[PDB]
Amino acid sequence: AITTQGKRIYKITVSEAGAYATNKHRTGYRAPIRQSNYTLTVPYDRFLPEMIRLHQSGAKIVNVTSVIS
Amino acid sequence: SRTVITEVIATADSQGRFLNSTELQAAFGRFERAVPAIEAARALTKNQDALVKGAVQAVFKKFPYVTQPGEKGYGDSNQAKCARDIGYYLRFITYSLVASGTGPLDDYVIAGLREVNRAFNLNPLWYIEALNYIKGETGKLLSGQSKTEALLYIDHAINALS
Amino acid sequence: SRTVITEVIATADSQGRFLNSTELQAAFGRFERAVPAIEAARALTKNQDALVKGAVQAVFKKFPYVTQPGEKGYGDSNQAKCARDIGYYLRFITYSLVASGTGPLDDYVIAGLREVNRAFNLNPLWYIEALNYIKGETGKLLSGQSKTEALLYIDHAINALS
Amino acid sequence: SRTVITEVIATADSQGRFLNSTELQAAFGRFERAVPAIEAARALTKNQDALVKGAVQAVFKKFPYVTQPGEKGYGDSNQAKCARDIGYYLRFITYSLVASGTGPLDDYVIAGLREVNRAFNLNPLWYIEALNYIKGETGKLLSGQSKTEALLYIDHAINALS
Amino acid sequence: SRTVITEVIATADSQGRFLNSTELQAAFGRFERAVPAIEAARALTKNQDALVKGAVQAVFKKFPYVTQPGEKGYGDSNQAKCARDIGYYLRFITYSLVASGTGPLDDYVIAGLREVNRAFNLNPLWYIEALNYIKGETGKLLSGQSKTEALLYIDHAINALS
Amino acid sequence: RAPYDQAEISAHLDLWNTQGYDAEIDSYVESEEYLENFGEDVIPYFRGFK
Amino acid sequence: MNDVFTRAIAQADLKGSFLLESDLDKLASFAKEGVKRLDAVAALTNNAPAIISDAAHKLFAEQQELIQPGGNAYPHRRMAACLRDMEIILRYVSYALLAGDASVLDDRCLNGLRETYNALGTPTQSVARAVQLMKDAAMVHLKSTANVTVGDCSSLYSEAATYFDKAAASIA
Amino acid sequence: MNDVFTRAIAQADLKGSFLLESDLDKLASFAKEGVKRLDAVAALTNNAPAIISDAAHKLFAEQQELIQPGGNAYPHRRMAACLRDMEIILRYVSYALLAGDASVLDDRCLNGLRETYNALGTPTQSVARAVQLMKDAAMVHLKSTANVTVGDCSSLYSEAATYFDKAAASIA
Amino acid sequence: MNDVFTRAIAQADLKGSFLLESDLDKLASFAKEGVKRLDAVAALTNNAPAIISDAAHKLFAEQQELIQPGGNAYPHRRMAACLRDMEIILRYVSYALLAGDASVLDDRCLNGLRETYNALGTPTQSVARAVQLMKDAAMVHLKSTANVTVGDCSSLYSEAATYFDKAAASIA
Amino acid sequence: MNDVFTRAIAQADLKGSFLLESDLDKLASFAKEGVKRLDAVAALTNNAPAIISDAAHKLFAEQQELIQPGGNAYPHRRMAACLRDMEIILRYVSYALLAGDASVLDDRCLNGLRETYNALGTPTQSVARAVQLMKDAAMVHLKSTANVTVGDCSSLYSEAATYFDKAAASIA
Amino acid sequence: ERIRALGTIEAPRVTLRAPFTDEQFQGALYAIYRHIFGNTYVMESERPT
């Protein structure tokens, strides 16, 4: 995150519509559970792989906001 | 649901590259064996009542105590929902046969099977004998490869119950 | 971008502690010879036209196959693109010089260079030879410390390309 | 130890790359910044015992109760080993001057300082103001360029103690 | 904050399980010990002013130089601050006694104590000996197992300081 | 856990040599294995014993 | 997460004074009634599986669309989750009963449960009715004078009823 | 994630009956020209890099204001992200081409692609135009019957056009 | 995280034209006064604990409600958090000063800081007063001529005052 | 990690004494002549592809049985790993040249390399030969007089040769 | 017990959810600095604030 492109991070508001809990019913809750709506803040250098992992899981995002400007 | 082609897109989207020869090949094989699966599902779609009632009477005759008073097999509504449960197993096996993937089964019955059998005191032995009887009648109704593909999803349901 | 001040501040903020002796010494080392860098950038910003035409003609000379029709080097718009490319590289070398670091050079040329170059079918040796000519003539347009800074930054660009 | 050279190498090492322009820039700044630092170290080393005696008596003058019977400064062992501690601090300040980095301070003194001061009830203020006395005495012991370096390291030690 | 009940609920909920016999056991032990701690905290509340005045006199007798001008303890404002700090410690001891846990004490005094004492250069030994004085006075102000629990809480505060 | 095979060492060494320490570390924490085993809110522990 | 004793402690800190003898007497009363409180929470935990199975039977009797296809509980894992969430709310209510504070449940989960059950489209009034049936089935078990020395526990029944009422209303 | 078979099962289950004979006939047809659609997939995947390169060339041909310094595709990492986005869009459309269902695309990143572009400030119209020119290049590649036995395959072309159309509509 | 050089390069690339003569000359000047800048940031770093302690003393003296029970800095934990925030603010101010650009401060230290205090109930006016007293102490420690060679640094004091003041405004 | 200064410091500290006058003289001479060291390190850094390529050409033109099938550099993955190891060893030699001390080399490249190469079956004799070939190609580059002022650097030639020989003797 | 590793299996799993007060935080920090750094001592200076 030394260069300028590393900063200008983004904040993602993620909803937990049942499309991921339906798979995790089969995978298993081998960690303590949390509520539905939660917000993650990701830097630009890994924004794409972050939301890609979320969608591989099956996350539904309501809105995405730019933290810097 | 995780069907064969659904497996293809799923196992593709995780990584960068497109659908290579292996995934096209798997989808190809599924596309051949789908049509026999469709006719097998049709043949299984004609005999709801016979299959369900034969399985019900088989599980009742194997377990004489559930019928007897004081046990949860006793009852009019109880037997009606016995029939509804076996119809559910039949329709979900039909869905799996149509989709050529265990997706519908894992989604609609197997997910959360243990916990609900726990809380409602159901015994998997009843349903497993029902599925064995359904295996028996698929042995006669279906022949050859269609019989094999039907039996494979069926005994997948057995493996899920056990 | 990434200038000496940039790494100094980033490393100091990483441990969450003030700038100690080492960071100030690094900033001083950058500051004291900011002047050969700026005078070198001034010396090679006046000659940018000569630089770009010389680099383009040297690329044409070294690689005869990129001149005749049937390839990307041929073409009026394509040669305008070549001149624009060389101008962009030289401008980013000037930015690296004024920054007293490789930062602007990095996050304008070097980052994402391989796949951008590849998806459009451009030989890296083309731009490597162009920058080699720029090296050759900036060895004489600049003398001493400014020459050292030039040589080092253009060669860093070359090594990135190669 | 964390110096300019070592920090440069570790930064260019963790990133898996050669040493580019900025790194040699910082290295050069260190190399020519060395001479004032080496002279400061020579002066502090030559004037070692006088500085230690001065800092010890400054501790006692500012903290008069400490030498009164029943507590820390009472008795010959605690004075001789006060001298030992001030000698350690002075030695590591000169080490950090020669290395032109806060490596030796952050390793042999600053790392683990609060725990051992807490477990022995050694008041940091004794050391803070002994270092303040040495900070003052370098004003008339050194002068010019190396005075800034020596003050900078005396200063880092004082900040870490506080 | 944190009592036996609170730690019960936390540990039970952390493993995601119902509230079984072991934590019921801890709850019952704390519930039985409730009344003596209640009486102890009541007795301590009866003696706020006497305890705090005696504690500041103890710190003045053990740290006479503190009272001199130019020190921390000079000035009637710092005298009232002595009284206020001792009263805060005593009040949080009584809070711990009522809550039957070190919780209120922890999150009101111990939470971030070293940093604050270092910022304003307060000495932990002042409060340590003042708590020893409160120990000495509660050794006579009190009676029974109330002694053992009150002294345990005071000793916990002391150990946090030390 | 311990490494399972040599391909893990080869892959991670190449990942480091090409992308740096930060990417090398991210390949561990952002991996699906950490997320499934420990997730966002569990401290890592020696799970390789079972 | 907080208990009644620490509520007294926190309000005493806020007003800056020592704990008053009135609140101290209240806390002594709570501490001596804690013997009955422990039996109440023990009854809840002991009978939790029976209570949840009972309330599941009554719910699936009174509400039927959770059976029919397209109903929320029709898919098998979904009504597995129904039972699991019923168990979770009972566990949190047992926590609250032991603590004597309703916030340990409310502030812990009811903030997110409202938006979750709004988004999921589930009939949330059905979940409130589930809480009510849970309360009734637990009330049936808490009045079991067998196995326990007979005493006065009307206040404990009122506390449990109000805790479940607040849980359902926050759900509702 | 839902394909056409999964979608049909979804309807059949939510109604509560089985699949009707019409459903089986439709799905038998789908399995019959599964071979043709897999040939379309193979053409799309193998010809994908050429499609991307030609697409980028023509896209920069219509509008140059992305290439000029400070342009939306100037920085050579932001045009790099441009190319990567085109590549992943083509891959997603191939995924939909297999699935035969619009659900797999919309569920996969098309919910928040709009908002990432809005917050980032990416011009959605340029993305859409890149989509249509990609669709044209892909269609031209799927016209080529060299190495693949001839047949009637207009349905696949229509389906791919609709896929690229929904991608553009969700983007812009 | 930008300095004057990176920022100027950013606008130069936004235009697309080479850097001029005058701006490059003022950058060379900036380099020349870079030594006075390094001594300024050194004076800020060297005395950071003293500045924090004196600013804290003055601030807590002026607003006694912060210290008293129920105030926002009452327990040891909250006082430590206050002093740590003061030190972090000063640290980012020195970062910006050495960078010569306010970008370092605003890009990471001030983004979500404004609303975190409000959500916490922290009065941001008190934080503004804290950083103002910090600015006063930093000016006092900056005008010191001991142990350094004397010269004109009025631009440095103005720049530091601007950094402190805009940190105050952005927090408030 | 170490360098010459920290090595002298560590020796003096383990002994317990200030740095003597002679050792200060040695470190002062080192720092004074370190500009030639920077030129050498730059000569290694800037020409490194040339060194690696010439060494690879010679190694595989003299030792054919590496590139043969069944040879231990046969496929592209093994050849790429060969070249990557060559570059890494050259990298740590340039590091140790800048530092003036071979501790970084012996701690990051050489402390487990013979064992790794034995456990992989790679002939460590051929790896040492590759290192010596890189040494030869590099010495052709450190003696270059173009773009640098004339002078004597026999000391740096000897030092770099000893670093390459350390790598060779700790792999072989 | 035949392995060395009984203390490490019996050790309870430690989790830290967002609404924590004070002390489970102070315990989770200890657990993290004990595991991640591999039971190596992390002096008070090294610990990041």
Ligand SMILES: CCC1=C(C)/C(=C/C2=NC(=C\c3[nH]c(/C=C4\NC(=O)[C@H](C)[C@H]4CC)c(C)c3CCC(=O)O)/C(CCC(=O)O)=C2C)NC1=O
């Ligand atoms: C998604 C598909 C699905 C499955 C698989 C399923 C199993 C199932 N069967 C149930 C009832 C039942 N099911 C049975 C049938 C069994 N007991 C007898 O011994 C028979 C031998 C045997 C039949 C093979 C009985 C007796 C009950 C009565 C329990 C009750 O009162 O709900 C219940 C309780 C809720 C209800 O249906 O009213 C479930 C969850 N439910 C589903 O929605």
Ligand SMILES: CCC1=C(C)/C(=C/C2=NC(=C\c3[nH]c(/C=C4\NC(=O)[C@H](C)[C@H]4CC)c(C)c3CCC(=O)O)/C(CCC(=O)O)=C2C)NC1=O
């Ligand atoms: C500031 C960042 C930046 C870089 C690095 C850059 C290089 C670059 N030059 C391009 C076009 C081109 N560039 C060339 C030049 C090459 N082919 C031959 O003529 C020469 C031997 C050789 C030059 C030495 C040509 C022919 C094209 C035509 C389109 C293509 O081949 O993709 C393209 C494709 C998109 C475009 O700009 O039109 C890039 C990315 N452009 C940038 O905006």
Ligand SMILES: CCC1=C(C)/C(=C/C2=NC(=C\c3[nH]c(/C=C4\NC(=O)[C@H](C)[C@H]4CC)c(C)c3CCC(=O)O)/C(CCC(=O)O)=C2C)NC1=O
């Ligand atoms: C690496 C460098 C290093 C430092 C800095 C260091 C400090 C140090 N000082 C110590 C003891 C001590 N240090 C002092 C210092 C006091 N004496 C006078 O009265 C003054 C008021 C004041 C000095 C300014 C005293 C009184 C003790 C003995 C206290 C005790 O035994 O508990 C000890 C405990 C071990 C021992 O000496 O027996 C350490 C570790 N040790 C080190 O290895």
Ligand SMILES: CCC1=C(C)/C(=C/C2=NC(=C\c3[nH]c(/C=C4\NC(=O)[C@H](C)[C@H]4CC)c(C)c3CCC(=O)O)/C(CCC(=O)O)=C2C)NC1=O
């Ligand atoms: C949670 C409860 C709590 C405690 C306990 C607490 C301790 C405490 N006492 C303070 C003042 C003080 N208290 C003392 C008293 C000490 N000096 C001598 O008189 C005695 C030996 C000794 C007390 C017996 C002094 C000298 C100060 C002023 C410190 C200073 O301004 O530098 C301050 C600084 C407040 C200010 O003036 O800005 C704190 C934080 N703070 C709290 O929020």
Ligand SMILES: CCC1=C(C)/C(=C/C2=NC(=C\c3[nH]c(/C=C4\NC(=O)[C@H](C)[C@H]4CC)c(C)c3CCC(=O)O)/C(CCC(=O)O)=C2C)NC1=O
């Ligand atoms: C540990 C604290 C906690 C609670 C309380 C909680 C509620 C909760 N229940 C859920 C699923 C569900 N919950 C229910 C239960 C309701 N539906 C109706 O049938 C019944 C009246 C009622 C039973 C009480 C159902 C049917 C689902 C399935 C919805 C889906 O998977 O899409 C979900 C979605 C994801 C999941 O957790 O599986 C949440 C967040 N989550 C938590 O982490």
Ligand SMILES: CCC1=C(C)/C(=C/C2=NC(=C\c3[nH]c(/C=C4\NC(=O)[C@H](C)[C@H]4CC)c(C)c3CCC(=O)O)/C(CCC(=O)O)=C2C)NC1=O
């Ligand atoms: C091992 C875990 C554990 C438990 C469970 C526990 C509770 C507990 N309940 C007790 C009696 C009691 N138990 C109850 C509660 C019952 N009385 C009925 O009327 C109610 C329906 C019912 C409420 C659920 C009452 C009221 C007493 C007598 C206390 C009194 O005088 O009010 C006793 C004292 C035995 C005696 O009085 O002879 C204990 C220790 N303590 C423990 O360490």
Ligand SMILES: CCC1=C(C)/C(=C/C2=NC(=C\c3[nH]c(/C=C4\NC(=O)[C@H](C)[C@H]4CC)c(C)c3CCC(=O)O)/C(CCC(=O)O)=C2C)NC1=O
């Ligand atoms: C392993 C993955 C895979 C491959 C490699 C594949 C190629 C493929 N295409 C086939 C038939 C075919 N192939 C096509 C291809 C179309 N014809 C038009 O020219 C279009 C341009 C083109 C693209 C849609 C058609 C229309 C058929 C005939 C389908 C039928 O039997 O009615 C056949 C069977 C040949 C036969 O029945 O003797 C194969 C193996 N199919 C696959 O599932």
Ligand SMILES: CCC1=C(C)/C(=C/C2=NC(=C\c3[nH]c(/C=C4\NC(=O)[C@H](C)[C@H]4CC)c(C)c3CCC(=O)O)/C(CCC(=O)O)=C2C)NC1=O
């Ligand atoms: C290695 C880290 C480092 C240090 C230790 C440092 C101190 C430092 N101050 C210098 C001169 C100076 N420094 C200042 C600034 C001071 N004068 C006024 O008293 C102001 C209050 C104050 C500003 C905070 C001035 C005015 C000069 C002389 C003008 C000039 O730099 O050419 C110089 C250059 C010439 C010399 O003094 O020998 C250095 C190296 N600079 C650094 O980069």
Ligand SMILES: CCC1=C(C)/C(=C/C2=NC(=C\c3[nH]c(/C=C4\NC(=O)[C@H](C)[C@H]4CC)c(C)c3CCC(=O)O)/C(CCC(=O)O)=C2C)NC1=O
């Ligand atoms: C940014 C990184 C950086 C570089 C690249 C750099 C090179 C550099 N080389 C220099 C001199 C020199 N350079 C060399 C090295 C050459 N002469 C030998 O014969 C060989 C041909 C070859 C080395 C093997 C020598 C011997 C000197 C003169 C020694 C001296 O400065 O006293 C000088 C000082 C000017 C002078 O005194 O002539 C610089 C700044 N400095 C840097 O800070």
Ligand SMILES: CCC1=C(C)/C(=C\C2=NC(=C\c3[nH]c(/C=C4\NC(=O)[C@H](C)[C@H]4CC)c(C)c3CCC(=O)O)/C(CCC(=O)O)=C2C)NC1=O
């Ligand atoms: C996982 C599937 C998915 C993708 C790929 C997506 C788009 C997307 N594009 C991004 C960057 C970008 N994407 C584009 C592309 C657009 N701008 C123009 O050039 C073109 C007309 C057009 C290309 C189709 C550009 C230019 C950026 C650079 C943003 C910047 O650096 O400021 C990013 C930020 C992550 C990163 O680049 O590291 C995302 C998430 N949204 C998704 O849900």
